[PDB]
Every structure is written in structure tokens, then in C-alpha cells.
């Protein structure tokens, strides 16, 4: 509908796949080469389904900060025959607050879904499903089951992936450029 939705759509149309684990179907962001991200609660194993194709997992790393606190981001390298467009230059370098973000989801349950979530707070610490978690972003939208893995964007920046909610607020794990130096 406007330039925020334009940037979100450009990311969804080239840099997302549908990931299926034994814990459900997730929006999955591809970042570069065969490297993608997914919430750590997806419990990625040795095999994952990518757009309903059986795919070997070459590597999976559940990120934690240097205090050994959960970040809720798993970086997955996929045995896929095709690379993602490199979008690492759209990742923020530092923790920050944002205005006017969009949350975008693409699954069997929620195809071509875009939500203007408004202002995004650097919330920091969250007890997420009982797990102490750091680098959480918060937005005041009543997000629902089916949205985990959804991509959080502003114009020109890919800032996080949706990992939870409390009924009135939604929570995303930050994406930082430093996670994807190779």
C-alpha cells in the first residue's frame, strides 16, 4: 500500500521459503548463499522440508549471547541447489529502536500476509515460554500462532524475525550483520 510494504514485498518474493519441522510450518528468511534463519523453538534437526521438499541440514547453530543467554535465532545451512539473493547489506549493525515496521508472513495458513505493526522498541530481556531471552524487539500488535519466523522490516532494513507474543504485544529476535560474517 506504501513504501514500507514495497520493501517488505521485495524481501518476501525473493528471500523467503516455507520451512516445516516436527514443531510446525514457519516463515524462513534466506540471508545469503544457502544460509537461512528460523526461531530456535522450531527444533531444526538433520532433515527439514523447504517448500515441501525433503532437504538435508548441513549445519544448524542456536545463537546465544556472550553471557550464554538464548537469542532465539537458529542459523541453518541448507543442502539446496540454489542460492538466496545476498541481503546482508540490509541488516542493522547495532541494537536499536525503529519506527513504522511491517511484519510479513508466508505459510499454507497465512499466504501473502503483511501487518503494519508501528513503533518497535528495543525491549531487551524477555522470559519467552519460560526461557530467559535477550535482544528482543517489541511491537504493540496482537500477533497469533502461525506468525513465528515472520520477517520484521522497515524501509531499507531487515531488523528481526517474529518469535512470540502475549496476546497484546508481539516480540521479534534482532538480526545483526555480525551474525552472518563468513
Ligand X SMILES: CS(=O)(=O)Nc1ccc(C(=O)O)cc1
Residue ranges binding ligand X (CB under 6 A): 70, 130-131
The C-alpha cell 530456535 sits at 40
Nearest to 148 by CA among 181, 172, 175: 172
Is position 89 annotated as part of the catalytic site? Answer: no
CB of 69 to ligand X, least distance (A): 7
For ligand X, the closer of residues 27 and 70 by Cβ is 70
Catalytic option among 41, 106, 134, 162: 41
Could you give the CA distance from residue 3 to residue 14 in angstroms, rounded to a whole number? 17
Cβ atoms of 160 and 148 closer than 8 Å: no
If the CB atoms of residues 15 and 21 are measured against ligand X, the closer one turns out to be 21
Closest contact distance (angstroms) between CB of 27 and ligand X is: 21
Q: Which residues pair with 158 in a beta bridge?
A: 153
Whether 61 is a known active-site residue: answer: no
Nearest to 31 by CA among 171, 173, 160: 160
Minimum CB–partner distance for residue 139 and ligand X (Å) = 23
Out of 106, 134, 148, 162, the active site residue is 148
Q: Is 41 a catalytic residue?
A: yes
CA angle at 120 for the pair 180 and 15, rounded to the nearest 5°: 40
Residues annotated as catalytic are 41, 72, 148
Amino acid at each position: 500500500m506504501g513504501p514500507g510494504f514495497d520493501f517488505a514485498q521485495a524481501i518476501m518474493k525473493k528471500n523467503t521459503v516455507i520451512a516445516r519441522t516436527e514443531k510446525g510450518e514457519f516463515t524462513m528468511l534466506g540471508v545469503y548463499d544457502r544460509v537461512a534463519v528460523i526461531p530456535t523453538h522450531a527444533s531444526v534437526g538433520e532433515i527439514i522440508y523447504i517448500n515441501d521438499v525433503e532437504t538435508r541440514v548441513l549445519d544448524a547453530c542456536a545463537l546465544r549471547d556472550l553471557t550464554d543467554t538464548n537469542l532465539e535465532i537458529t542459523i541453518v545451512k541448507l543442502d539446496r541447489n540454489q542460492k538466496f539473493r545476498d541481503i546482508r547489506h540490509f541488516l542493522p549493525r547495532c541494537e536499536d529502536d525503529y519506527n513504522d515496521a511491517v511484519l510479513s508472513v508466508h505459510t499454507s495458513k497465512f499466504p501473502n500476509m503483511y501487518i503494519p505493526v508501528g513503533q518497535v522498541t528495543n525491549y531487551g530481556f524477555l522470559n519467552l515460554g519460560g526461557t530467559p531471552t535477550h535482544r528482543i524487539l517489541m511491537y504493540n500488535f496482537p500477533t497469533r500462532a502461525g506468525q513465528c519466523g515472520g520477517v520484521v522490516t522497515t524501509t531499507g532494513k531487515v531488523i528481526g524475525i517474529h518469535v512470540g507474543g502475549n496476546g497484546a504485544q508481539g516480540f521479534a529476535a534482532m538480526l545483526l550483520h555480525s551474525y552472518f560474517t563468513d
